[PDB]
Amino acid sequence: KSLRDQLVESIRNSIARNVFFVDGGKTTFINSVVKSLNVNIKCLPTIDPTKLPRHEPILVTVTARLNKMVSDKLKGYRKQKEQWQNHLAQLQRGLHLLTDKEYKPEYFSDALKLSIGGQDLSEIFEELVKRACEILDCKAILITFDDIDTQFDAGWDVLESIRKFFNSRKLVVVATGDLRLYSQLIRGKQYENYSKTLLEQEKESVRLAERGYMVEHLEQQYLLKLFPVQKRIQLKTMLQLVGEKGKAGKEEIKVKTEPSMQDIDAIDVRQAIGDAVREGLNLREGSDADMYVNELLKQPVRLLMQVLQDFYTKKYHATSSVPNLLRNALYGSMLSNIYRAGLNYEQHRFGMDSLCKDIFTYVKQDRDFNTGFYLRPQSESEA
């Protein structure tokens, strides 16, 4: 919550690239920041790129929302209205550009109808932005963008929106997600600029490596300007939201394990996790259980919340084994990890026998073989 506080203050101190980013839930935080934004700057309902039909331009989506709020302030209380439809029509008319699979020759006369010379959609959109800022009497606008984890290919489109339409002095941006995915996106695009024949001709180590070098160089020079360092917000993780072993505790969280949990019976967070692990692992209060639960709180927020929200759910259900409840939570939480590990997938075939082979394999990909039977959570692989 302090994260969003400092974010709001900073971007407020951003108006006197123009892109802020949030690494990571990401969507919850972004919605929080938006509502916090409700020094006059206007926000847009966040665009979820992965929730948009497969063929629009991000810019047309933007312009649709823009039409909405602009008309809304316009339906409220005109000589500005007709001027606005002027730019709207000009843009729409010059909207085919990004679209067409070719260039149509008859468009030349349109290209000769009348301050840079041409049908720059960037300047058209910036004129739109100017008109909107005038109309809504705001210093600028923010454009807000959702994680592309469910579809990481679309965000590329958002970035092109950025560079062809978002190089404005009246727009700030706020994106979220993993820059990792943006990285392979942009690098992959880059290779898409290579000529194939060249690729399948000049294909051994020397130039393959130099090509990788040049492409990664461009990737870096590219994303770097795309996301200025000052404008990323780290966002504090859950475990760093909380004392690692009690020598910390910046804003303890506290959670409610029962339905009643009248704001005082909420069983901390760390202590509830420790209980779950210890008596769900028959594990005592040593540090290994402690270190377990720390490496249990290091997991993605949704993962941990789900596995800690089901275990106590079924525990209360049965209260009207802890090690079987917690195992059911782990199974439904990590089935993909266990399933991809080649580990037993069927549930009715559990017995004991499955266990021996299961852990024997586990140590086989965890290497170890010295204390693999410890089943200790210290693999460089998060699964």
Place this chain on the structure above:
Amino acid sequence: MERFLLNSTVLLYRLSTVSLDEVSLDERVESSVFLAQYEQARSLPDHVAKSAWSYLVQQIKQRNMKLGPVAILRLIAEKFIKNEKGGPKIDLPMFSEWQTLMSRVSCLPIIACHQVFNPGPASQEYSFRWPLYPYHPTVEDYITRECLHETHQHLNGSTSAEECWLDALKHPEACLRDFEKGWASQEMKQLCAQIDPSLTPRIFKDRLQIACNIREILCRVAQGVELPEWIASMQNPQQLANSTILHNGREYGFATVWPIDDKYSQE
């Protein structure tokens, strides 16, 4: 062609139904105009219609006006009414045309138009005198010498209709009474359907209330009085079918103050 833009049931329907901030109606207006002219003047050979409308819009744009009753009155007055000797008059050649018009439209708005944007010398205080007339010295001398002689006056009591408009506005409830007591009459049913198919006494009274409200509001603005707040809430024309307006929980009357005691006097 102007006449239709001031007399068109379809135009009224569209304007009344549609909202107040929609803007850019020209296409709808054009369509309504052609439907109307089709209804009244059947014989027009259907292309003179486009020619005339186009010429009108050419006039509006060239004189930098917007489609609207103001520009309509502009064209009408400049076309018809001139100032000569004493007060404004109608040119002799276009007199017959003028009656063809007045058969369908009221002169008073046109007269105000002429006085306002083309007053005669600022020496004759003009007092509204209807109807307007042309000028002929010979005829005028004959009238002075012999005066006229009225034998047949039995149409609308003995007054002209434009007065009955203000009379109903004074007495709208009773006008509604007279309408309804007779609306059951088939002949009245036939006439009402013929002119406005979907009239009914309900929309009769509704239009009456709307007109009263519009008059009060526009008198306020003509006095240039601060555009009272509830206009902001005022968003659909239908809302004027009520004697009042609800802005935020509070109901506001449309009445304003008038310089003249008879708020219904043609003066």
Place this chain on the structure above:
Amino acid sequence: MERFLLNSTVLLYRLSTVSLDEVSLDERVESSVFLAQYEQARSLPDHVAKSAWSYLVQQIKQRNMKLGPVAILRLIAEKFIKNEKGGPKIDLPMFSEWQTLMSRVSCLPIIACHQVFNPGPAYSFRWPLYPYHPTVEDYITRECLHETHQHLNGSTSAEECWLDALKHPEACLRDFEKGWASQEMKQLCAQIDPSLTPRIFKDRLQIACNIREILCRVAQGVELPEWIASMQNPQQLANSTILHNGREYGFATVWPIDDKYSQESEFCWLTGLLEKWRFNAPEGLERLLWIYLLIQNQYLTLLVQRTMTELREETEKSYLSRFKHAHGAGVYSQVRYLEGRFAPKSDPNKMQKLLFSVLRGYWEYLSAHMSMEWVHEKPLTISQVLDNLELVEPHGKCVELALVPHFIKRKPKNGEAYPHALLFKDLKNQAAILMDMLKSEPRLTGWIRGVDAAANEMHAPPELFCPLFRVLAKSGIAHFTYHVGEDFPHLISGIRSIDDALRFLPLRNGDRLGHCTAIGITPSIWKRSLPLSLSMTKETRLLDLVFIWRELRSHPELLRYASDAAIEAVRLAHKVFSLEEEVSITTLDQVFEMRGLLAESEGLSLWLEEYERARELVKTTGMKRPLKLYKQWLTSDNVRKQRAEYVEVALEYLPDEAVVALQQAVMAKMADRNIAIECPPTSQYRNVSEHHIFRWMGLPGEAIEGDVPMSICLGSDDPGIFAADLKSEFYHLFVVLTRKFGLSPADALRKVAEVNENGRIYRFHDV
């Protein structure tokens, strides 16, 4: 009054809206009828309608019928039709009235009713009906007619098109909505039925299908399927099927005939239904019949007042139908010389498909009458068809076909190199297609006899086509036709159009123009409801002024007007060209006489000669100023803007006398060039007797002193009637002349003849 009961949008609305068990509704009729008549025949004096309806119901009650199409049709049939010599025929005095009605309704139901309640001596349905006159019949037999103007609904009568729609309902939908976006038909639809919309369009169509199905079931008298009981609200018939109790029941049933949508099928069906209802009818089914008939009527009216449906006419069925109708019911063809007018298609393949369809239909028609070695008994290519046809000879037993492609002129678009450039692109495309077929198969030239340029005139002036006509002539197109004088901003404008067509188009002796209504209408009856001033294009205004001066130069009694027109034309030229120097009207004419030249000749194989037709002009040294002005007029954006601009013209700008002098000068040119006019019957005319056809044909009290004979021919194209025919309008002309003009029948027969022989004399058919 009757017509309103069968043709009324409001009646349709009320009937469809009210439930099927309502009963005691005759007020809805009397009220709705007064409405519908108020809209349509507004002029009735508010009491005649009352009295007429009262007398109608009077007759109904006296004769003990129920208000309904049974009684209405019985009244109409007894009043109009009789049984006479051969099949029922119609009274000569009442013929014009019958046509006035056919402008509103369809004959077929009335016909069936007459057969039912008054069959002749113990017939095959045939449309249209006719009166009788022995002399006229003998004339027609001895000479037959000659169809010269048939292009209204393709070339077919609409009543078949309605059946065609029911056959391909979806298709007529498609055509409707594709065009529903076009403004023009939106206004037409609003004017006809305000709340029409494609939605209720579909609804009414499928409903009518339902009704015909159900009424056919009862006409066969079949055990009255249960679901009628559930059928309670006409809108229930707006769906392809109906739900009785959990089950969904369709309406299709077995009909004796194979062509389920045949006019003859409908004839037999309605005959049986009426026979079963000779004494009474179930009110629900009877309401079904009103609604059916009404829907027919309004759809038909829409159609007449008006692409894929036409494409559906591209089988050798419609044309064979056309030919069988053209031939009478007898062994010899009722008509002699037919003109086959067809819309050109931009695709060579569509073009050849249409051509083969037409040709095969004609060959089959001829085969159905003559026996002879056909070489290819089952031809499949146009080549084989012509191989069959060339063996045919002009005995006259069958019809002789002459084929002509239409040229449709569209309004110029917002932006182009020169006016109508794109339209000219399209037209040259069609023409190239045509000439290349001519090359490939030269034999068609004996069949494609002339090319015609039709459609609303203002969208393009004729000169756009002179190079087209010239190149086509060199291709081998004998004859040329171009619609003129029909519709126009000002009567002077129409006259100018006609004369410029004369002086510009490559028209040879005997060519035929078309409507030319401008030279037909008097100024007296040309202004009857019009505004006192008329807005019209600046360019056309200038052309009219130039033309007026050109013509009236030589007339002493109008020299004032001539000098005027010169002066105003000069002023208009200065403004439109925004001229800086002085321009003489002489120079203006030098400019405007050039309008027959192709834009892209030299100022912008067969097309060569015309490409260079600008060469001699440019060679002409003294034409400098005219050439530059012409170039500007074509290209200058400002000039084209002012050309589009409009201006008012005094209704009575020129005296009727001046107008008549202009017209008569035009007729002088026409006779000089021996060019004919296809005059069909058709807005301002309250009665047909006011028809300008008569003015030419020389009626005392109608012809004008300076009139000259103009070689007029007959045309079976009346825009606002159903199942019109060349014979029908021959009857029209004969009866009107005989009765309204009192001429002896021999005289009237002669008078209509000379027009008929004009048609033959100037026939486009190969010799």
